[PDB]
Amino acid sequence: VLVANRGEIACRVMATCRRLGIKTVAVYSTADEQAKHVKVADESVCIGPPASVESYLCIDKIVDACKKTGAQAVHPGYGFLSENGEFQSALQKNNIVFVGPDAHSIESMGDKIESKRLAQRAGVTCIPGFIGEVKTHEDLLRFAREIGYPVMIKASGGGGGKGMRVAYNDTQCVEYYDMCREEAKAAFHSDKMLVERFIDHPRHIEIQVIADRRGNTVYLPERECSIQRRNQKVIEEAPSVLLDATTRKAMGEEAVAMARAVQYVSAGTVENVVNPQKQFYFLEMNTRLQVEHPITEEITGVDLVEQMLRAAADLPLSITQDDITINGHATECRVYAEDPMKNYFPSIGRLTMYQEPTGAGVRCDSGIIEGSQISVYYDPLICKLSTWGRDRAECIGRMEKALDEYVIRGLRHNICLLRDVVTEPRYRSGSITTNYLQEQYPNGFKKAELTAEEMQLMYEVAACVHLKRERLHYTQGTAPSERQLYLSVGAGQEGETPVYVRYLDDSHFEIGASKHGPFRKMEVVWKASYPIIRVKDGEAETVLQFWGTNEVTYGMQMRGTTFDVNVMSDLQSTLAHFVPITEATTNTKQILSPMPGVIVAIKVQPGQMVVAGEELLTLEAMKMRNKIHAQADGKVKEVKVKLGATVEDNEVLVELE
Amino acid sequence: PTAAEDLRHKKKRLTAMERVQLFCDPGTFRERDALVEHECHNFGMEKRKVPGDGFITGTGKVFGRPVFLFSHDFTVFGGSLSRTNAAKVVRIMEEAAKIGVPVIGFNDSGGARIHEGVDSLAGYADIFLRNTLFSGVIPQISVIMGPCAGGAVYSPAITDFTFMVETSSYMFVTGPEVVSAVGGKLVTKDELGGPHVHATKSGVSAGTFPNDIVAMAQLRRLYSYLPLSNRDPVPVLPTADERYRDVSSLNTVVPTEVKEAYDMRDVIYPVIDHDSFFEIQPQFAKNIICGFARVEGRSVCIIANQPKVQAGVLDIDSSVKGARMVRFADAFNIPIITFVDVPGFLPGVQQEYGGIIRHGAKLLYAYAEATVPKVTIITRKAYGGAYDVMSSKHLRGDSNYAWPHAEIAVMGAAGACKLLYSKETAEQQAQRIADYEKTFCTPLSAARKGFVDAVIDPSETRMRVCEDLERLARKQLQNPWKKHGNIPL
Numbered sequence A: 001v002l003v004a005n006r007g008e009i010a011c012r013v014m015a016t017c018r019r020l021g022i023k024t025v026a027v028y029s030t031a032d033e034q035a036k037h038v039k040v041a042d043e044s045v046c047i048g049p050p051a052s053v054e055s056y057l058c059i060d061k062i063v064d065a066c067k068k069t070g071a072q073a074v075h076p077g078y079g080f081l082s083e084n085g086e087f088q089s090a091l092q093k094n095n096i097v098f099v100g101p102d103a104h105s106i107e108s109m110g111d112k113i114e115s116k117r118l119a120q121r122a123g124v125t126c127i128p129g130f131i132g133e134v135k136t137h138e139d140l141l142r143f144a145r146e147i148g149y150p151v152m153i154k155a156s157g158g159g160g161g162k163g164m165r166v167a168y169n170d171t172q173c174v175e176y177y178d179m180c181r182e183e184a185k186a187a188f189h190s191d192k193m194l195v196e197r198f199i200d201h202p203r204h205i206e207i208q209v210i211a212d213r214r215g216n217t218v219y220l221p222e223r224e225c226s227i228q229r230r231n232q233k234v235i236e237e238a239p240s241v242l243l244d245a246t247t248r249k250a251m252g253e254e255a256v257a258m259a260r261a262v263q264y265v266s267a268g269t270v271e272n273v274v275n276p277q278k279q280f281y282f283l284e285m286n287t288r289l290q291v292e293h294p295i296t297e298e299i300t301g302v303d304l305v306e307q308m309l310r311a312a313a314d315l316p317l318s319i320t321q322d323d324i325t326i327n328g329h330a331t332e333c334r335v336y337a338e339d340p341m342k343n344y345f346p347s348i349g350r351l352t353m354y355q356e357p358t359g360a361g362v363r364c365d366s367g368i369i370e371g372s373q374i375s376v377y378y379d380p381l382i383c384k385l386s387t388w389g390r391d392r393a394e395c396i397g398r399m400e401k402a403l404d405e406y407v408i409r410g411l412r413h414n415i416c417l418l419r420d421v422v423t424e425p426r427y428r429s430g431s432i433t434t435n436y437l438q439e440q441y442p443n444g445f446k447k448a449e450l451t452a453e454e455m456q457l458m459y460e461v462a463a464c465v466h467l468k469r470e471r472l473h474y475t476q477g478t479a480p481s482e483r484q485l486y487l488s489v490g491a492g493q494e495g496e497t498p499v500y501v502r503y504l505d506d507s508h509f510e511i512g513a514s515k516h517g518p519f520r521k522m523e524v525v526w527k528a529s530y531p532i533i534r535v536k537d538g539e540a541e542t543v544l545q546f547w548g549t550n551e552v553t554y555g556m557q558m559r560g561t562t563f564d565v566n567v568m569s570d571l572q573s574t575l576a577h578f579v580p581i582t583e584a585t586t587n588t589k590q591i592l593s594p595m596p597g598v599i600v601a602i603k604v605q606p607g608q609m610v611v612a613g614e615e616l617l618t619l620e621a622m623k624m625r626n627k628i629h630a631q632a633d634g635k636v637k638e639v640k641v642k643l644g645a646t647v648e649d650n651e652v653l654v655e656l657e
Numbered sequence B: 001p002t003a004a005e006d007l008r009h010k011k012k013r014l015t016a017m018e019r020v021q022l023f024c025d026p027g028t029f030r031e032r033d034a035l036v037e038h039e040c041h042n043f044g045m046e047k048r049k050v051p052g053d054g055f056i057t058g059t060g061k062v063f064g065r066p067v068f069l070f071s072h073d074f075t076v077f078g079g080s081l082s083r084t085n086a087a088k089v090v091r092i093m094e095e096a097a098k099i100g101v102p103v104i105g106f107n108d109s110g111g112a113r114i115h116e117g118v119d120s121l122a123g124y125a126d127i128f129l130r131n132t133l134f135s136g137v138i139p140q141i142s143v144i145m146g147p148c149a150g151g152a153v154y155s156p157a158i159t160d161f162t163f164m165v166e167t168s169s170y171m172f173v174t175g176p177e178v179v180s181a182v183g184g185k186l187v188t189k190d191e192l193g194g195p196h197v198h199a200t201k202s203g204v205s206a207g208t209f210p211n212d213i214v215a216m217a218q219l220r221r222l223y224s225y226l227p228l229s230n231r232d233p234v235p236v237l238p239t240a241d242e243r244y245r246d247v248s249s250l251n252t253v254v255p256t257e258v259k260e261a262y263d264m265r266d267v268i269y270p271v272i273d274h275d276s277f278f279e280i281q282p283q284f285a286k287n288i289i290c291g292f293a294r295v296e297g298r299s300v301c302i303i304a305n306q307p308k309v310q311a312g313v314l315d316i317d318s319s320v321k322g323a324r325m326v327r328f329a330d331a332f333n334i335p336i337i338t339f340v341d342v343p344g345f346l347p348g349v350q351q352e353y354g355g356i357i358r359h360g361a362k363l364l365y366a367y368a369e370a371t372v373p374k375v376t377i378i379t380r381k382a383y384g385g386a387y388d389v390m391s392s393k394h395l396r397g398d399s400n401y402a403w404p405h406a407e408i409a410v411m412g413a414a415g416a417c418k419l420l421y422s423k424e425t426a427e428q429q430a431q432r433i434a435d436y437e438k439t440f441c442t443p444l445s446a447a448r449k450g451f452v453d454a455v456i457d458p459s460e461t462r463m464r465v466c467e468d469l470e471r472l473a474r475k476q477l478q479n480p481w482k483k484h485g486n487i488p489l
């Protein structure tokens, strides 16, 4: 079989075949000649230029290419043009298997409209509210009391969240209807309002579904997709805390009942919104192969890929709802190349200087091997880290530990945000909401700080590392074994903390306050000039990272955050006070081209916003295109140098004001 | 007790003794001479004698290995040299010539001492002669912590490496007063000879540091690389890194387009051991990189082009930089590893008006004269005389390697097509340039001739380099008998 995706899922598929003993083929674009899925595959064929359209999206190339492998079936994947009719039609022109759902169900359910029809076909507890215009305030109050809901005032013709106000009491109902009619009459030319059961605070619970072309339909355990930034989810978890069998059993039964309704074959997944009063709302249903199943597979072992490919041959499944159980729970997170602390700045075109994944009792699905890069015109996802567990505390701690052991170098990421979110006591309380993120991050993003004991431990580990790397340079036995260091982070030596060290063995020290002070005998295990640093005092265990140094300042990472600790002796400490600290030039002015050349491409527009790290234009000289970018600034005021202006000579190409 | 140094620190500056204490080991400095006077007897100098006479000379010890050093003192007479100051320095250099030990000096002198007359010139001449004679015998490093003017500037110049401190140091031959007197332009001391000027414009300073503390901390690290003398072998340090570490990221560094640029450090860093690069002259002639690095625990010399800056084109400044680095590396038996990516020489009238012919020959002379083991890797391209200059196999090179997408040709395809068909029918571009580039802009022809040993996968570079550098440990080559060469100055 041949896949249709070029991400982690492709690798997953070419991995499921291992046990299924199925030879696999994987196509690629020109830029992806070095992707892992190309080498993992048994066969590879090029699909032209790497721009999205020609790459994979070029059905004609793809369907035509499906004539040499011999494979009797070809996976549709989950992204790009997966589950598409124009594609399903073409594949049934050449009479080949789709390894996916049937057309009628797909167009009946994935369609934007008429989904409410199928929803109300059997009702299935669809959105509740007075189905019609509320012409009077009396009707609005009466229908609000009917269910005593937060009103969910929404315009009949309005969409996207415009014309919506949340009413909690009758006076609020009247005032918000007065505002809503005024807003909607001006904005959408419709005064027709509707009132529905608004949700106190949503959790966005999701229910998984599987089926088959013969029978033995099964309901998979539900999942969580509460956390969501810009309508994109981050953290997922299958057995949500607010789970009662009274609801859940009916959820599975109703999902299976809806399944046969449209004769769905390859079930996508069911979407719900759940309030603390344990309701459910079948709508916004999915018909795509969601790849958040690893979590469910961790709590079940139900290999969705194997079962769906088995059903693609008109055979029933190998599992029934009778044996499906729960053996704990799993947590999954997504690693993006999106720089959060810097206003969510995108960082692309950077191959991995060097990276190593966490592999301690955890699972990681990724398509980015060492020496791989991310283009602008693709998904900036790095890895899909998922860890098995049985208890919240157990599963989370694992994630905590596994986050710190993920070495990524060569480009930014959002691991700090994931770490801070997981460590927050609100997240460990047990329950969350969908507005959780912006509720806990009002102004931008700011990572939480360190407690006193954590900073002390970081100091101790830094001193141990300094001594261990110092002993390497000495010759033969003429080496020291004890010092007294003065650690102080910050440019002003904030909190000078005297530290000792003794190095009793290769990976054991006798850290103390100073000489003639009680000693603790911690342990540090670190390979010289490497990232990972495992330190264990008593039971507590920590993992820190070592970035680099200039022999007075150490670049060490603590809880997914970079710091610069200063490790200096008595003389250096007493002398660093008497050192000039000059301030570098802070110039917000025009930028000039360093060398002569020709401008062939421009990226930014005249007199608009500019952010740090953004490419601006590209000169070509002596057969070579450079690319001077914007180091750092907010905006510009200038006149653009036109295309093909072979002038340069250190002119003012862009002027920053 | 912190007497007499409060006046110094109040100006945000350190003292000579404090610098010496910071450089060496905690308790291994033994000051040599401390009670010496100037015995001048002129211009009312018979009084105000000083015990130290403005110099601190000792022995010290760094990383368990011996050293010699001296430091000027700015408080006493402004650091001026004399018939008596220079005697201590001469004695130290002579002793460090008998024993195979290097010398490091921290310059702070304000100029010559006028009250001694021509005795200051005598001392300067003796120091110059010692530097000239002992260059190439023991490594010499110089750091400039404060003002350095007059004719005293020449002795740091002859030394192998000169470093500078950022805020409070400068160096030049003639002061701005004379410049105003003759030309009439008002230029400040920093605008004339500041650390930035010598870092970027003149190319004299080999580096710049932000503070004295950082200067000492990194000077120790630099010292950890050098061999002790001319006859001593290259130092080898223990290291947990191993030649079997996987480097497969090199397969993707070179883009598939011939007009796109990349950073050569992405090729340099994987091959060498982790966090073991010490760049030399980082802000001058950025199209070429030179420095020191370790390969399997032994120090080597690195010289590579960079297509990031000016398409990696050789030039005057790059030629001088590479020539000096190669000469120093060969003088002390240090292996050389080079990475080649050059389209040719920089074209321009200013270049010929500035003597490209002289300067470009220096790098070729340095590469041909060298007798240390050499390893060369051609990543993408090498054209014209630039291929010859950058350690080609014919210049007694030990082992040469190429990557599968390399190109070695006489010149670009356009010029060859033009010269090979004078008045051939128009549109000849499309069906001739492509064919010529396909047939002869590839390493197959150069491999057929025997100019590259083998064509290797980019993932095997570390393995090959470690193997070759281990095997070549005991090469013995000698040049014909000469009093000395005649390099194109």
Ligand SMILES: O=CCCCC[C@@H]1SC[C@@H]2NC(=O)N[C@@H]21
Pocket: A622, A623, B313, B343, B344, B345, B346, B347, B412, B414
């Ligand atoms: O084709 C016309 C210009 C080609 C220049 C190619 C580079 S620029 C500097 C160097 N000198 C040459 O002759 N070729 C290279």
